[PDB]
């Protein structure tokens, strides 16, 4: 179970999501393009330090709550966390 | 479980919770036991919602009762619009 060994609370697309910003809208919150967005949420293995700290900064989040990983890791990740709750949910 | 419900100085609304955990209408109706229209409904507008189907979302997204927003459709979209052009005004104002 990926999502409870980990520090990590959100992905990058879980952070811009929960706020219904469009890749669009925090493209141009970051000064970067879309296609950087979306590449960065498809996969964060190699996410520049200066945009990761944008991240944290827009979201008042720290750097171990975030989820970085490739597209495989990030379902994993998003997946073992939706199965987390169900299963405390279900512990009563 | 601290690592496990993710804090928040801010009210959810009943989408977002689902949302959060990142669940399907039909999963989390399956989970509280009620239709997933039950769950469409409910998402759109709070104003009835059962304490029973309410107390269910307290308990699993470990929330309080003063942590979830409830209302109809209009209310729901002010305030989650309203928390959008917070994040990105409070972002800006720092640059």
Not at 31 to 60: C, G, H, P, W
Not at 67 to 86: A, C, H, P, Q, R
Request: avoid cysteine; charge should be positive.
């Amino acid at each position: 179970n990926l999502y409870f060994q980990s520090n990590a609370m959100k992905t990058l697309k879980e952070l811009r999501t929960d706020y219904g910003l469009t890749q669009k809208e925090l493209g141009d919150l970051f000064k970067v393009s879309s296609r950087t967005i979306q590449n960065m949420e498809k996969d964060s293995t190699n996410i520049k330090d200066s945009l990761l700290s944008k991240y944290m900064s827009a979201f008042n989040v720290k750097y171990d709550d975030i989820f970085l990983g490739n597209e495989y890791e990030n379902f994993v990740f998003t997946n073992d966390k939706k199965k987390s709750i169900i299963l405390a949910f279900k512990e009563k």
